[PDB]
């Protein structure tokens, strides 16, 4: 077997699990983008990327088992449900959480506003490059990827222009301009700094915990700070197992996933390498929920929202990453970056149309709302009486008029017949509304 | 474009009429010397680019004519015929106008550059230039030198810029919000000026 997982997960534990099952594990960089263009037997990744793969057909529709379905949490199965079919085996539930230093501070900050004072006193730093880490602050005040109504995601409605998204992004860039976080800090810098204790607190998921455990500095895992009196809403990840469409060993890989990996022993051997977080298996999750960090992850997931499985999530992630990088580096303002994100999300726009709208946003931000409205309009456009019978000696015919009274109606008909040179006896049928003159 | 030409010619006519009346009557009583000082400072600040980069003979010639006529009016009021001038009734505080106008020019200007700051300051000071004259007439109650021709030409000047702004906004799609607002303030002040003159002098 050939397996691709991210570099920050427990690839060694997966290696021993495959050893007991040959199974090869690899952790290429940018694999969430490598996989579609390259096509590995089974790929381990968050569910948001998987639905788009199912649109390409790269993931083979796998028939589940009712007992095996009941062996896992129902919402994890709901995550990998796209158009009524299951495309992946959920493995773990991961959510972002605050990891602070007990030595540096006893109580974590209850809100984002407290962070500037504590940081300037110490004189927080997380990975600002990926939008996954910077999204909880954006979504704390109502910014959303796609409007979720009655069980469906409305692609026509994107909430990255919300006042809450603007507030979160401007708070982040204010903290950047106040020298509280390095504009170009990334995951490696965040891990290195928090391991040495230089940074009191950082935002990260379960996987980093083992790394922090190597740093042997006492750390507390808890709720992400609230932004303007509202909780942070991190996207909830479901690390799931997807089968390749072109895998020659589809049945063997499926059996391996069901009978070695998604078991108590296999998941225990995987979580030891790197903390999987909230485990999909009922038994191991019950055995593991007693740990306070797992409880913090689960409650943060409850405060957050799970990512949509729709295929418009890769474009959304690219657009939000571009906007966050632009706002953080200072190349562009917050509002301009969010308008760029909206333009880049719009799927039906042609490349040259999108470039034109982006240029229009660049060179005049006073009418950004009107430019966005016109771009959305273009995007939606490119989405894939009384009657007379006369019987004379020479002329015969019929004629209809608009009359409310029959007396005036027959007066008009008599005048018309005189104008037509007609002279004869008159009859009226009121039921048929017909005046008949005949000679 | 003829509306702005006609308004500027009417303003120059008003200035020339006032200067000639002061010269002929051998007195400047009834005129606020502080208002004319503010007008002179408006023309000085707006036309400081007279020395450098002349655009046309009409342009620089009109700038020089305005500056010279206003300076001559100030000289006649304060130097030549200062004996007839009555500063007792012209007690208005000029700094109370210049300082807020300077601050407002710093704050509300389009762009923060010395020439743009100077132009905005001149526009605002022109908008509030006539206030000392209004106060002087409101106190004394008469204007021995203000004439019907002067007021008529000033009102024609203001109405011509009003028509010019409407024409530019509706045909050329151009409006200068600072200029429009300051001109509206000046037009209201001039209407009050005409009201005071007709009700109290005539």
């Amino acid at each position: 077997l050939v397996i691709w997982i991210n570099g920050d997960k427990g690839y060694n534990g997966l290696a021993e699990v495959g050893k007991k099952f040959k199974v090869t594990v690899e952790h290429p960089d940018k694999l969430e983008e490598k996989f579609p263009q390259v096509a590995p037997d089974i790929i381990f990744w968050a569910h948001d990327r998987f639905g788009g793969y199912a649109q390409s057909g790269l993931l083979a529709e796998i028939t589940p088992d009712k007992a095996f379905q009941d062996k896992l949490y129902p919402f994890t199965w709901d995550a990998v449900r796209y158009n009524g079919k299951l495309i992946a085996y959920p493995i773990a539930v991961e959510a972002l959480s605050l990891i602070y230093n007990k030595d540096l501070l006893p109580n974590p900050p209850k809100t984002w506003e407290e962070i500037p004072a504590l940081d300037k006193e110490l004189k927080l730093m997380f990975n600002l490059q990926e939008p996954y880490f910077t999204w909880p602050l954006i979504a704390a005040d109502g910014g959303y990827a796609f409007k979720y109504e009655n069980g469906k995601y409305d692609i026509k409605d994107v909430g990255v222009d919300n006042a809450g998204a603007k507030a979160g992004l401007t708070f982040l860039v204010d903290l950047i301009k106040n020298k509280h976080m390095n504009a170009d800090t990334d995951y490696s810098i965040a891990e290195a700094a928090f391991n040495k204790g230089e940074t009191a607190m950082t935002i990260n998921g379960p996987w980093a915990w083992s790394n922090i455990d190597t740093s042997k500095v006492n750390y507390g895992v808890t709720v992400l700070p609230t932004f303007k009196g509202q909780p942070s809403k991190p996207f909830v990840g479901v690390l799931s197992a997807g089968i390749n469409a072109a895998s020659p060993n589809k049945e063997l890989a499926k059996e391996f996933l069901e009978n070695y990996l998604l078991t108590d022993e296999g998941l225990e051997a995987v979580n030891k390498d790197k903390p999987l977080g909230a485990v999909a298996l009922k038994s191991y999750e019950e055995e593991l929920a007693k740990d306070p960090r797992i409880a913090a992850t689960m409650e943060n997931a409850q405060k957050g929202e799970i990512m949509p499985n729709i295929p418009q999530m890769s474009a959304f992630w690219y657009a939000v990453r571009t906007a966050v990088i632009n706002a953080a580096s200072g190349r562009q303002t917050v509002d301009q970056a969010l308008a760029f994100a909206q333009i880049l999300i719009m799927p039906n726009l042609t490349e040259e149309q999108r470039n034109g709208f982006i240029q229009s946003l660049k060179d005049d931000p006073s009418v950004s709302k009107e430019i966005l409205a016109e771009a959305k309009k273009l995007n939606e456009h490119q989405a894939p009486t009384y009657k007379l019978v006369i019987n004379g000696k020479t002329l015969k015919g019929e004629t209809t008029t608009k009359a409310v009274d029959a007396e005036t109606a027959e007066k008009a008909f008599k005048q018309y017949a005189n104008d037509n040179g007609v002279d004869g006896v008159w009859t009226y049928d009121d039921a048929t509304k017909t005046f008949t003159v005949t000679e | 474009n003829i509306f702005r030409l006609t308004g500027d010619l009417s303003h120059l006519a008003a200035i020339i009429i006032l200067l000639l009346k002061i010269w002929k009557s051998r007195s400047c009583a009834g005129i606020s010397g502080k208002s004319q000082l503010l007008f002179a400072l408006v023309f000085t600040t707006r036309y400081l680019d007279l020395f450098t980069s002349f655009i046309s003979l009409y342009n620089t010639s009109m700038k020089l004519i305005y500056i010279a006529c206003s300076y001559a009016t100030v000289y006649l009021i304060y130097m030549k015929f200062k004996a007839t001038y009555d500063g007792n009734h012209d007690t208005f505080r000029v700094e109370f106008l210049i300082v807020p106008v300077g601050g407002l020019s710093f704050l509300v200007n389009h762009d923060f550059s010395p020439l743009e700051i100077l132009w905005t300051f001149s526009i605002y000071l022109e908008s509030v230039a006539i206030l000392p004259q209004l106060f002087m007439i409101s106190k004394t109650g008469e204007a021995e030198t203000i004439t019907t021709h002067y007021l008529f030409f000033l009102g024609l000047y203001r109405a011509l810029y009003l028509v010019n702004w409407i024409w530019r906004y509706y045909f050329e799609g151009f409006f200068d919000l600072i200029a429009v607002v300051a001109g509206v303030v000046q037009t209201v002040l001039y209407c009050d000026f005409f009201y005071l003159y007709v009700t109290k002098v005539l």
Partner: nanobody, 121 residues
């Protein structure tokens, strides 16, 4: 004397994009205003967009607001009009007009030759 050259016009499909540019040659003025007009055959000349020399002020016609965007380049002494989501009703000859916004400069009012924009439905 100032000469105005307009470029960027051409034939574009409906819904496409275009970028017009008015470049002024001659001695620049401290304060000027440039207005993009359009004239279709047999129709009156209507203003499309308007920008000044300094500031963030831009004005757009009701028909083109949100689709057309006017910007300036003082360093290059140029003004650009970006046309997005073009429709065949936007077929016309587009002119650029430079006015001296300073005092006593009524005859500093220069027009471009004209550029042809044709939206093929």
């Amino acid at each position: 004397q100032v000469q105005l050259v307009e470029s960027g016009g051409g034939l574009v499909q409906a819904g496409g994009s275009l970028r017009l540019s008015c470049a002024a040659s001659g001695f620049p003025v401290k304060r000027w205003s440039m207005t993009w007009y359009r004239q279709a055959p047999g129709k009156e000349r209507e203003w499309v967009a308007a920008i000044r020399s300094a500031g963030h002020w831009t004005h757009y016609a009701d028909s083109v607001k949100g689709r057309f965007t006017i910007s300036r380049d003082n360093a290059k002494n140029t003004v650009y009009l970006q046309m997005n989501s073009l429709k065949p009703e936007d077929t016309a000859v587009y002119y650029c007009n430079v006015k001296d916004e300073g005092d006593f400069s009524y005859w500093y009012d220069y027009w471009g030759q004209g550029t042809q924009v044709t939206v093929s439905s």
